[model samples]
Target: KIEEGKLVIWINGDKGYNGLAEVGKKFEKDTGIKVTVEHPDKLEEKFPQVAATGDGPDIIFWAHDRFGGYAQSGLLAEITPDKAFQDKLYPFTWDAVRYNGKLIAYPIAVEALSLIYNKDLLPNPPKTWEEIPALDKELKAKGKSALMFNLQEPYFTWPLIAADGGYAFKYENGKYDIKDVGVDNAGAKAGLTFLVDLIKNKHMNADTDYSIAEAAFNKGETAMTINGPWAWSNIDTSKVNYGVTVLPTFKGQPSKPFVGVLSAGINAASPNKELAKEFLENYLLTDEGLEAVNKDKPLGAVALKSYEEELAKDPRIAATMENAQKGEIMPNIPQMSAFWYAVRTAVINAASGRQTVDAALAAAQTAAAAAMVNSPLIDAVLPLRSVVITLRWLSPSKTGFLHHAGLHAWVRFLAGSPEQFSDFIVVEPIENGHISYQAGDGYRFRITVLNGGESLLDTLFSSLKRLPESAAAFSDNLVLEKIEDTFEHHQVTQIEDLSVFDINALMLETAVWSRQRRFKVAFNTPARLVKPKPEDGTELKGQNRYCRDKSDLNWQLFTHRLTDTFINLFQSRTGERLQRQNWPEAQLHAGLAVWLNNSYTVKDASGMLAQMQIEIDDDFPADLLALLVLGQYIGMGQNRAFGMGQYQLQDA
Candidate 1:
């Protein structure tokens, strides 16, 4: 084994895949053994069982968020470096990897949010959040928004709450006090109220998702944004003259971002355990290894003092480190499972005016406490007895592919045959729905595991070892980009056969709980016209149909388009009818012409943007709302599968 020099490393292929591969080459050449570095599709979801069963890699790389779960489950090998190597790493980095007083990973880089700005617009960045509104007034003459960030994402929003004395969990008696949830506190409510005010006014809007926010900053429509290093490529430096600094103070107190550490850990059951430890201690933590990894993609900050000199010279790295110095270490404990959804929903509910600020916060706090007590914290952190995992691969070069064919092919081969895939879930040989993507030229290939798909998940992971070495390849040769991973808590404790219960029908009935719950809609994308024939309330698909100008806003067309789309989607997914009578009132309140003159390069047409506000008089049934959400996911009118017809719906 030593002569052959074999080791296996697994890293999430999203953001930092290529950087690690280069380091792997160095480790291999110097050590005289061949090492295979694999990027599994959904490693976070698959790792626990994969390692527990002894089918995992010698070394694994991932963020600190899930380290606690893996350690608690006894999937990770306990790791600690020698005195010299230990001295080189920062003490805080160790805190990220430690679980119950034992080291679990090798700290690589630190991540924290900072205010990245356009130097062209904001030559002098504001030092206090209080200065922003005044600065916004000055920017209005130039036709620009003062700031933009993904308001819907709690990761970015948490800092404001923290700046005003809101903590996810209070530190008491030397540990995180799970019972002392602070999300419903006065300061958190103040932050929520502040954010609501921004959206209520025209300063920022609810439609600003992550991509749109980055696009706004890069497009020069905004003066500033709050984001991290991974967004560097999307900033388009050629046109966006930008710089970085710590987030401005919220209320005379500095806004604090959650500091996350990127680290390396080992599989407790790896056959090459000794090799894994040696590779980490000798090469990866050394200057040469660090240099190669940072050569392609620079770290926000390094725990090693040897690399501090390099980081000090980069202004962005300096800003990240400075912000991290003042930030709170995001807890990698079982309790944090409550924060992700509970805190985000509270902010979302309050921001969208679904409930009063206090009401929303109290509801969120109550939900979090109930989740913690009713479901043990360990259950939230641990992999589910049954997991619904989905992995989406995107390519901007290609726009369309048959969903059934691509997914079935992926599943069929990985499952050893079609019968194997059918063992988990049943589907027709060909699916009519499209695997979708963003508005630009792209396609997303997704493999989802819900229902009885845990066996499929395991089969796919086992089969992955024999697949092509080029798993990350894109048509344009750009592969190895970071994909997103999200986790949700479930209340499914014990599973009984629901086979005879008509689950979809039950869900549909539950979705439309009452007929009077009104819902407001914000169209997040440009919706192409849907033509209904005058002859019989039938739809016409004619090339010569009238195309309305951007100036001419049409609600009837918009309403018809959404309602028709929703009905079709509802029926297709649930095999049930959703009545139009349930939607008693449809009113159009406002519209914004976004990117009016910008060219849509992918479609080769002038960009015609339409963001509109509409409301239903009768309560939008939850089932109907759910249908609309699915429409948002699949798309609406022409070319919607490619990210068009997207919208946000709020309780009215």
Candidate 2:
């Protein structure tokens, strides 16, 4: 059933999809259904949240690796193309979109890492690992390296490791046996030993990252490098005579790289699921359609068999396809997430001599297992509800869109009576209120309601009738469209009748679980971290009150403010004081401080807004970390109610 006349599709990245836009125009001309292709920011994080509430786009374009997680989360529709349609695409392409025997996406392109060398420097690329030492010595004379790539990244290093029989998860019976992790096996250790030798013997740089490797290769500083077709654009622009081929053998064994597929999938909750499927099958997957897509964005290897003849015309694309054919399909399972982080850590540990190959791989396996078993406990105790309200501007704003103070006031006006508004501001039940400008659209206001605040949704809707007048006070002419409730994405039932004691226990458990992991707190909005007054009786005013120096912003100060915020939220919601306890003995070190200067004026106080990134130590108090987790939604520091200290927390 066609539920709407318009269809929305979201693709990640800033690159505009001109080819898809062209196809969209033709589709609208023929089917009379308007198609909107959007490049949305943070698609990976936001897609599942919005999709769970049935407010996501009809289709999503991304790499096939995420299909497993999406399908497992019930966000993707099961797609079964007819046999003829399936035969038209490479068989390996299908493996990437299948989970638990169900196809979840249509393959668009295929890619894999291969040996790309500067033809001008190296007449022929090395064919075996044993030849690297000689090549390294030869290049050293010319102030170059024989080869370089992201040595710590698993995607690039997998080929070398797998050459010695290393594997992330064993594939058997048409599915990944996640339990059968092979990274710590003897074959895997052998591969790591070889890599360590290369770094220690000066054949490769231990600190070589993706950017450094790519830059070196593009600048003709490296004779050869392991990369995929995606790097061709930069390499071509660099005017280097480069050639691509399958990776050189390690210990006379063929190196097997991971083959990745880029695909498009339909949202199961989409009202136009059938229409989306039809559009993909009939239009996007066609030879002409793929060619158009390639023109706009170079698709390394086209997945469709009908385009193989054309693909042969580009030797680089053909070489990538050849390398892909020799490679194993990258596992499209949720457990692969653990595998990636583990393998990357293992490489870093072994290469840096922080741990032996055996110890690193063993630790990696243990870490992966622990991560797979543990889940967030905070979700059960304090469920979070969110809504994304899009408002269209009726006329150009006199003072432009609402910023911090204006948006807070506008929401207060729409929140009905002063008593009801206090439920949001004073009690702190509703939080994460922030606005984002949508190009060609209007504004998106996102609000997250904490535990026991679902009633506020009704009040918010009732107040929307006054939007036109309320918006005017903020210097804007606006009208409310539809409100997209984004709470269902968490898949947790809200616990409404928890006592203060129950809350403390849950927080303790959440904190204890968090001790095993590291977290990154990103201040998404301008945060004012006010410094304490000095004992010398000197009053600090305005910008001086804020901590501008990175040296002053430590975990101690961060947690103190975070704890205070949590206490305020607890007192407002439960009407009870939180039981305080002694801080736990844990090593808390603040790592990587990034300050973003976004100065703003709120009322009579004008202050500089800055973003700070802090990493929570693994052994930090579990109870405090729980508060930090909740603090992510409520925010921290001055003017948090008006979205001044808005931030996001994620696994570091």
Candidate 3:
């Protein structure tokens, strides 16, 4: 099927259909035998169909996830490297192209989350996610637009959530394990919550659409953003010199960027399997093919082995190589589907005021788990509608141990949750008309346990230890605040088993303390609900500082600042249309809730299962703010920023 010396190719449209076209022209001109390349624009659709028909390309360039998935799916043709080609590639590059231990895709550049800062605005790239907001505020005050983000869509906040010790799916063994989806992980929840908090406190450069965020950055709205290298072409590099570095972390855990590789895979169904193998071996490994792709795509070398020496003359290329080495190889597992869909949905829902980050992710995990089970959407079912309560107490319990144990309880509670809480507490009578306890020795706990497992609309939690506690209960008692956090507590006693010391009011203190601080919330979603996240807000931003989520206070939120300045102009328009069309249904549901009380269930057309169930919590507010423009406030404090800036509807 192959001309003695000619090489065949297929290029993915995502890389620009002309990527291989231009290279083919040069390769043929340079080598007499020739280079045959075909680039189709509909790679997303074509790759799968053609692969099914056994009519795909010889050397294909595509997205890393696709590359990995296709190779596993028998679409990509596997090709072994000749010793010469094998000797010349980088190790990670080689690894990127492999599927099931066989090299299916040729490695291009690997992109992981890195620290990128505008030199004109920030002389240094933030070492961690924690440094971003403070810098944004500082930069904006200087009359500079802050942070340019690349997510074609803002609702997709996975990387940032990850930086905060959160995850969308469980990474176990070599593949994504949906059964263990971590979107609800305390870390992932905190990460998402932090973003919501960032937007709320006016610390973030808001907007879910890239155009808006990019425009703001161009105009100087905020400061830095964690994005990919492709962003370099569009950023306003003229006025400000920029610096790219690695994401800073808490506890030394790196802010992991999913590494994307352009792999060369073999189609299992291809008739020209041998020919394809020969082509990747000779043509792809050469300086001509590798160099051309490297230059055209502006990537670090795919052939990990020789790219270093090949690019020895360039310092920036070397830095890129170094970054690739540090990345978490973008995984190639079927379970990845749930992660992308769920994380994006949860984040957007939280962003759009539809759900709380904590609740959305908890539900998302349940969804992921159900999907993994391949059964009906039955995860941990909630108890029939029942009254839930809030309790607080001060015991000899150590705050640290309670935080630790609470984590596991939270995970299980969420896993089995949508459950009601028993709002009762036992506390020692106060000695000085105040709760008797040391700093963290005392805790305030609030639990929102509702009857039945229905999606919660909005929720907020906060606390104050230093403030005079002078304000109303709801006003002063919240956490992760932009103002001075007063929820911090000092533990005086070290209890071996904190599980025995259960009190509702103390639960309020625990939630308040955890909420006010970042990462410090108890983190054991799998252990005990009392186990808190490992670190607090400030300490949480360290690189790779992700934690597990609490099925409860399991806190998370993003800021509205970015959306206020700008948004994905197009996405917002389309999203608004989607919202408008669904208005009738939403209104009908509202009416149903009023009549249903604590019990409402309805079936779909097929009568196969209930279309939607409505369980109205008595504690729920009567009015809902259904504004896509201000999605950051959905699950945070009562329309306020850490109890600071609550939004009041304009008088009609």
The weakest ten consecutive residues by lDDT in model 2 span 372-381
Predicted structure 2: clash tally: 1
Estimate the TM-score for candidate 3: 0.50
| Candidate order, lDDT descending | 2, 1, 3
CA lDDT, every model vs. true structure: 0.61, 0.68, 0.42
Predict model 1's lDDT versus the native: 0.61
Model 1 misplaced stretches (Cα beyond 4 Å)? 1-14, 32-46, 49-58, 233-239, 352-356, 370-652
Model 1 earns a TM-score of 0.57
RMSD of each: 19.9, 16.6, 23.8
What lDDT score is found at residue 497 in candidate 2? 24
RMSD (CA, angstroms), candidate 3: 23.8
lDDT of 1 by residue, 1-652 (tens): 1122488878765355577677778777887767777888757655654554345677778778767867766668888677777888888888888888999999888878899999999999999877887888889889997999998878888888888877788887778776688888888888778778877877778667787888889988999999877666556554688988989998888887888887888887676777888888888787777767666556568777788667778888888988888887877775564566677778788778787888988866754543221111111112322222223233333222432333455445555554424323322221223334432332323333332345555565455433333242222222222221212233221222111111122223233323334445555544555445568665655433423354445566565666665454334323445466433445565455543322332331212355555555444444344444433333456534333445565555
| lDDT tens digits by residue: candidate 3, 1-652 | 2234555667653242344455566655655535666767645434554454334555566656666546544566556667666767677667656667776766655554455566766776666666666766666677764455644342235556665566545566666565666667777777778777766776653444655655555555546655554454445443546666655663355555556676666556555566555555665556666666554444543445555465655544555555556545656664454456556667667766679888888866755443211100000111111111132332222232221223224322332322322111111111122233332233343222211212321121122222224233122222221211112222211111112111122222232222222211110111111122356544434212221221222111111221221122212222321111111111111111011111123100000000111222222221111221122111122111111111221111
